[PDB]
Structures are given as structure tokens and as C-alpha cells.
Amino acid sequence: AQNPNCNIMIFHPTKEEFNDFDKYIAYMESQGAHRAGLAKIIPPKEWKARETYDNISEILIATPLQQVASGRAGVFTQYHKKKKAMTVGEYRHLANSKKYQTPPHQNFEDLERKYWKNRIYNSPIYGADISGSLFDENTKQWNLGHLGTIQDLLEKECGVVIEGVNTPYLYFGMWKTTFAWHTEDMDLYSINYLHLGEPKTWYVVPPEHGQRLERLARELFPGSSRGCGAFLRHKVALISPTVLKENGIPFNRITQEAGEFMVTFPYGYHAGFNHGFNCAEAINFATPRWIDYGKMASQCSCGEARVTFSMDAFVRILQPERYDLWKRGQD
Ligand SMILES: O=C(O)CNC(=O)C(=O)O
Ligand SMILES: [Mg+2]
Ligand code: NI
Ligand SMILES: [Zn+2]
């Protein structure tokens, strides 16, 4: 079995190997990359996403989200308070202000220590979940707006044509902005490109051990767990590396820098934080190997998770027994 310890693998494809996206994902899996739940891909030196980032300041962040924490430093939830619209130039100035800017630090490990010590005492503002793309239309390799769609993959594997679309999303971050522990909708893959700015630190649980994280989460968030049998779908719970280690939960960590891709694999729980002002692009995708994960994915039906239009067909076709309950939670 390749990668039996489930380490995060880093890949350096050549420009030739960068042509065929599906083929390279399959290659990484042949080497055991998916066992970690997360892989890093460093593009060949010849590649670029676009020419420059000098002209992005007029993008609008219609609903910036202030991420307010509750709990203790290593075990907390966050809620999202909606703020007034602002441009990317305005948001960048805010991120760099004395109130929000990254503190002085020695290295990534020192900043990680500071994050986990102090995160709860601040409420950073995240420009998350903005439909759009920063890839140039002329970029032919690993362009996240030109990937094969998940509806086409389902149709190719299973023969059923379905409605829905699959487009990317932009994320503008600042120091301490946080993504809570989650797997993707329908336990899909994700791919995330860090276009510019400061790093993003990731934590990940191997897919074969995801249920260990779920059991800990039920213990640590006992009210939330009574409320919903899949409350990590709400995407609000944080647990620190120290608490994971105290409870024997297998996990790994890595820091993504500008110009690098990360891939999350089906049922790979992940969480993390941004180091300072940055911009990432991400999208979900599928492969043949996903279909069995999609069929078995948990679902939230309590009302909280509320998701896109395109998840309806995935539940309907892959999980017909669960469909009526899930759709009620949508309504
Ligand atoms: O960057 C973020 O805030 C969150 N991203 C992801 O969870 C992802 O790419 O799968
Ligand atoms: Mg602009
Ligand atoms: Ni994700
Ligand atoms: Zn729920």
C-alpha cells in the first residue's frame, strides 16, 4: 500500500505532466497521496495563472464576514456576522491596518503558536465565497474555471444527465481568518490555488480516520451534536492541533504559499487559517473514485447547512433514500 502513514505529499509536475489534469490526479493517487486527505502541487516554472495582480482592487466583496469566536482557545466555534460591502482595495487596506495586521513573528511555527493562543480574542473579517475567477482565459493548464464539471462526471460514470453548474469561488483573507473543520459537499474533492499574498496553514485528517475526528467533535460540542447528526456540515467548529494530539486523533499540517495548489481528497477533513492579506480560488471536482464517497456522504437535514442548487441532483441520484429528509432541511 503506498503512503501507509498518510503523510501529506508534495508534487512537482513538469510542464508536460501539467497538461492533463485528470491524469495527474490519478497519478498522485497511484502514489498514495489521497491517504493524507490533502496534497500540495507546485506548478512548473514555465506556468503562470495570469500576467499580474495589479488590476484586482475594484472586485466587490458584497458580504464580508466577521468571524466571532466562542469557547476556549483550543476548542471554539465561530459565527459569521455580515458586514457592509467593500472593494478588494478597501479590504486590503483594512487587513493591513493596525487592528488587523499580522503581528511580528519569527517563522511560520511562531505565527502558528500565536494563532492558537490568541485567535478567539479577535474577530477578523473574511471575504469568502465570492463567485468568480482570476485565471486568465488563455491559461490552459490547471485553470480552475475550465475543469470538467461534476455533472458531466456523474453522467459519464452513471449515465444520468442532470441539471446544475460548477463554478469557482474567490476568498480574500486576512490574519486569523479561519476555515472550520469540514469535508466538502457530498465528500467531493476540492482544489485551491493561492493567487497572491500571505500564506494559508492547513490541518487535515486522513479519510480512513475521519470518523475519529467526528467522535471527538461530538464529545467537544455536545449541544451541537444533539442538534444535528452531521453538525460539522455547518462549518463552525475549530479544534487545535494540541487538542487533537491530546485525544490521539491522526492528523497532519502544512503551509501553502502563493503560487501553489492544494487538493483535498474525498472525506479528508480539513481546517486552517490565513497568515495575512491573501487571495485564493477554489472549486469542487469529482473523479470516478469519488462516486462511492458521494453515495455514503453524511448529510445535515436540520436546516443549518444550506447549500447550492447543484447539490440537489447529487443527493437525488446518489442517495434517494435520504433525499426527502434532506430537501426538507433545504426548505
Ligand atoms: O480557503 C478557505 O477558506 C477554505 N478552503 C477550502 O476549504 C478548500 O479549498 O477546500
Ligand atoms: Mg478590479
Ligand atoms: Ni474545503
Ligand atoms: Zn445540521
From Swiss-Prot:
Subcellular location: Nucleus
BP terms from Gene Ontology: cellular response to ionizing radiation; chromatin remodeling; double-strand break repair via homologous recombination; inflammatory response; positive regulation of chromatin binding; positive regulation of double-strand break repair via nonhomologous end joining; regulation of gene expression; regulation of protein phosphorylation
Zinc found in the keyword field: yes
PTM statement from Swiss-Prot or TrEMBL: Ubiquitinated via 'Lys-63'-linked ubiquitin chains. Deubiquitinated by USP14 with the help of TRIM14 leading to stabilization.
Residues in JmjN domain copies: 8-50
Single GO cellular component term: nucleoplasm
Cofactor(s) for this UniProt protein: Fe(2+)
Residues engaged in binding Fe cation: 182, 184, 270
Annotated residues for binding of Zn(2+): 228, 234, 300, 302
Similarity comment text for this entry: Belongs to the JHDM3 histone demethylase family.
Membrane spanning residue stretches: none
GO molecular function, one term: histone demethylase activity
Keywords: ADP-ribosylation, Chromatin regulator, Dioxygenase, Iron, Metal-binding, Nucleus, Oxidoreductase, Transcription, Transcription regulation, Ubl conjugation, Zinc
Residues carrying PolyADP-ribosyl glutamic acid: 16-17
Free-text function comment from the UniProt entry: Histone demethylase that specifically demethylates 'Lys-9' of histone H3, thereby playing a central role in histone code. Does not demethylate histone H3 'Lys-4', H3 'Lys-27', H3 'Lys-36' nor H4 'Lys-20'. Demethylates both di- and trimethylated H3 'Lys-9' residue, while it has no activity on monomethylated residues. Demethylation of Lys residue generates formaldehyde and succinate.
Residues given in the record as 2-oxoglutarate binding sites: 126, 192, 200, 235
EC number: 1.14.11.66
Highest taxon listed in the record's lineage: Eukaryota
Segment of the intact protein contained: 11 to 341 of 523
Protein name: Lysine-specific demethylase 4D
Domain JmjC: 136-302
UniProt cofactor note: Binds 1 Fe(2+) ion per subunit.
Organism (species): Homo sapiens
Catalysed transformations (reactions): N(6),N(6),N(6)-trimethyl-L-lysyl(9)-[histone H3] + 2 2-oxoglutarate + 2 O2 = N(6)-methyl-L-lysyl(9)-[histone H3] + 2 formaldehyde + 2 succinate + 2 CO2
Top-level EC class as recorded in UniProt: oxidoreductase
